[model samples]
Structures are given as C-alpha cells and as structure tokens.
Target chain A: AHLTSDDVNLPGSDFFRFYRSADKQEKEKARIYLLGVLDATEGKSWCQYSQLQTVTLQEFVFEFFNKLPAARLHERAAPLIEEALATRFPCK
Target chain B: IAHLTSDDVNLPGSDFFRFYRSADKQEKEKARIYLLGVLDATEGKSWCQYSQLQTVTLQEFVFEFFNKLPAARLHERAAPLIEEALATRFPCK
Candidate 1:
C-alpha cells in the first residue's frame, strides 16, 4: 500500500493508451487528469518556464504533441507535454 | 450541466498529462468535469477516504499535490497520487 517509483513515474505509453482508447469513460478520465495538470502549470516551471506570449494553451499543446516523435512516446508524459510546449514557446 | 458518466470509474494514472496539455478547450473542460467526478468516487473501503475533512475544490486538490510533490510525480498515475494527497492531507486521528 505504498507509493513505488513505478507509481510516481508513469510512462507516456500509458497516457497514449487512454488517449487513444475508444472507451468513453477512459477518454473522459484522461481529459480530467490532463486539465488538472494544465491548471497546475500556471507558472509552468518546466520547458524553461517561458511565458506563452504568442500561442494560446490550446494551440501550443496541439502543435507540440501533434509532432511528437515516435521514440518519445515511451518516456514520461508530464515532461513530454512540457517539452512539447517548450519547443513551441521556448525561453529567450 | 452536461453529464459524462453515471457508470463505472476506471481512471488511468499516466494519462493525466497527455490530455491536460491538449489544445482543445472542450477537451480540457472534459478533463475538468471528469476529474471532478473522479474525486467524488474516491470513497468507500480501501479507497482515499476524505470524509470529515474540509472540502477542497478540484483546483485546490490539484494545486496541493503539485505543490507538495516533485514535477515528475505529475506524470505518474494521478488517481493514486490524488488518493495519497487526500489521505496525507486529511489523515486524521
């Protein structure tokens, strides 16, 4: 009943599975979990913590993950999302 | 209010970020509503019981966990972490 490394560090594939899952319940769960993360990213210390000056949260997330590399899918989803946003709105 | 589900709840831990960073507002709202529903279901035996504790908004629930844990924890299964967050935050005598 303890939190293990596996518990705290989920793989991106897990995320992709739900995202790609056709089950409506799983899909909604994925959406809610994601919104919680975005809400926590008010100051977004990751992806160099740059301000999103040019793009909206929606567009930036769309473009970054849209071009997500195949190899990167197995990594952590949290960092991947931040890195994705970073690529679009990097710190100057 | 639009209803999402009145059935079984089985949320994945890792998928939190994939949907959270989505560019679609509706998707984001979907995530919000679903998560709100999620917190409600986290009760009953062997679950993250939050009874007798001060009510925390979904926003607060998220901010508290994110604030306490390292950023890497965000990628982990959110359901467990959320349970842990409540149990720890309101683990009473």
Candidate 2:
C-alpha cells in the first residue's frame, strides 16, 4: 500500500510529454529565484536581526504574493504589482 | 455584508460542487494543478506573512492560495506539494 506511488508509471510517456506535462520551465525558474531571494532573506542575519526592515519587507512580499493572481506573467504581473504597490506601499 | 462569499459547511464538499459545475476536464485539471502548486510551497510563508500583516483569520489565507495558482500545465507531482502547502498555512487562529 505504501509503495504504490504514482511516479512509477506516470501517464503520458511520449517523448515530448515531460516538457508538455511538466509545468512551464519558466515557472519553475521563477519559483526557484523567489526561493533564492527568500533564502537570502533568511540568510541575512542583519535582515532578521533588524525588525523594522524585516517586517516591512515581509509585509511587502505578503502583499505582493497575495494579489499575484494566475494568468500570463507579462500581462498579469504588472497589474498585480500595481495593485500591491497601490494597496501596500503607494508612493504619494 | 455586500460581498457574497463561498463560506460553507462541508457536506458533499463545496469544492467538488464548484469543480464539477463549471469548466472542462482540461480547465478543471489545470485548476487542480495550480491549486496543487500553491499547496506545495511552505505554508508558513503565507501564515507568517498574514501574521506580520496581523490577519488572524483564514479568509486571507484561503484567497492567498488562489493567487499563487500556476498559469500553465500543473503536473501530478504538484499534489503532495500542495498537501504540504495547505499544511503550512493551517491553524488559522
């Protein structure tokens, strides 16, 4: 029961299936970079040691990700950035 | 409240109704995939973000997952990732 993993014989084993079935490489790349940024955020002792900037950046990311709805990145991310900027950190 | 929300008590389950009611197999599959991806990430990111923003309720958390849904084909591998993602964002109080 424990060993019946889906990975053993995943559906659609065509030559192009991996690329087609796997998520867009760009997404994986983006998430990887984001995780890297977060890694840096976590690694930076100064960032964590200092509460003011830490909380600000954290809030910024939270608000940023909150409104980042799914869709075309080029078409969608701009509006999300605008919304986050306007809602969370507007320039007066 | 003027806003009509999807709040409900689980019976057959609200998501099942919504999943089956609208969209095709591809759309539904894509949606499930996207949800799985959002579910995969460390849930603490959301929870921590909300805490930092001082939102103790689960509403923001619920909506927050929707934001991160992938825009492309979501593989089956995304399922377990979502399991953890959901786990990370739980205990709303």
Candidate 3:
C-alpha cells in the first residue's frame, strides 16, 4: 500500500475541490493512480469519490460506491478520507 | 411495592399493539403506573400521556438504551417492568 494521503479528510464537495487543485496533468496522474489502487481491490478500489458523477463531491462519492463493491471500498475509502466516519450512535 | 411483571419485553410496534390487547382495566392500570413513575420524576400524573417517553429511555446507554431506561427509571421510582420495550418506536407521526 502507498503511504496514506490526507486527501480523504475533506468533506464530500471539498474533496473534488482538492482534487482539481492539483496540476491538470497531476490530477490525471492521480486519478490513474487511484484507479490502480481501486482496481486492485475486489470492489475496484471503491472510494467516496466513486459515487460522484459530476465535478461535485457527492458525485465522486457516488461514483466511488458504484465502482467499488461493498467489501473493497473501505480499503481505499478510509485511507483517502481526512477524518473518521464512525457513528456516534446514541446521543442523550 | 408491587412485584415487577414480565409484560414490558415487547418491542416497539408490538408493545403498543400489546397495550391495546390488554383488558381495559389493566391497560388503564398500566398507564397509571407509567404516569406515576413519570410523575415521580417530576412530571404531572394527570397529563402524563402527553409527556414524551424520552425521559423513560435515553439515546446514550450505548446498547439496550430502550429497555435500560424504563427498568432503571422505574426501578428507581419503585415501579418496575421485567421484560422490556424497544427503541425503534415512533409514538407520533
């Protein structure tokens, strides 16, 4: 596994903004790198961005889910994220 | 104090359904008992039905908060139900 990156911490929309901030060629390269990691996973490296269909962050997440199978998504997903996504559960 | 009964164990939808299933007298009796406990907790006994069940069960018991609240609070109030209700209930629309 490549060293974990902090790109995942940005919330849904902010994530895409971060993605586009990189150099155009670098962005394409990063996308390719992500595809590589995703393809290696059984679910095709499902990340939150996979859910995205547009330049928006939600589309990225949606695209990520659609691309990744349930099991493998978490591998790249958690690593890509900047913050924890755990449930607080009950809140009295 | 009256001994705790096993009737409280029914889950949410089932619990209300079961409440309706009991004889009128017992249903009123049970309602009164709940009101008494809620009133003991500083709520009004006569108008207790309008009171929400949140005080009976809180969201933060980690697990089993539903059953835990009623038993804990009722036990504290000297009214107890043995089994338990569920947390998935939505009393109003």
Best prediction by lDDT = 1
Candidate 1: tens digits of C-alpha lDDT, residues B6-31 = 12123334344344335776554454
> What lDDT tens digits, residue by residue, belong to model 1 across residues A1-92?
11111222334556556545678556545444444444333334333223433225545654565567768777766566556555555544
Evaluation by TM-score, superior candidate among 2 and 3: 2
* Regions of model 3 farther than 4 Å from truth: A1-18, A44-58, A62-78, A81-92, B1-93
Q: Interface RMSD, all models, one decimal each?
A: 11.4, 14.7, 26.2
- Give each model a TM-score: 0.39, 0.22, 0.20
Among incorrect, acceptable, medium and high, the docking class of model 1 is incorrect
lDDT of 3 at A47: 31
Model 2 misplaced stretches (Cα beyond 4 Å): A1-17, A20-92, B1-21, B47-89
Error of 1 at A45 (Å): 3.7
The sequence of per-residue lDDT tens digits that candidate 3 reaches over residues B1-93 is 122122222113224223323466554334323322222222122123223544334212212432345443532211122112221332223
Check candidate 1 and list the clashing pairs. Answer: A31-B31, A32-B31, A34-B20, A58-B23, B13-B77
Candidate 2 positional error at B21, Å? 5.4
Predicted candidate 2 versus true structure: per-residue lDDT over A1-92, tens digit per residue:
01111111111112112212245543332322222233222322223322334335435644455444334222422133234334544334
lDDT of each: 0.46, 0.31, 0.29
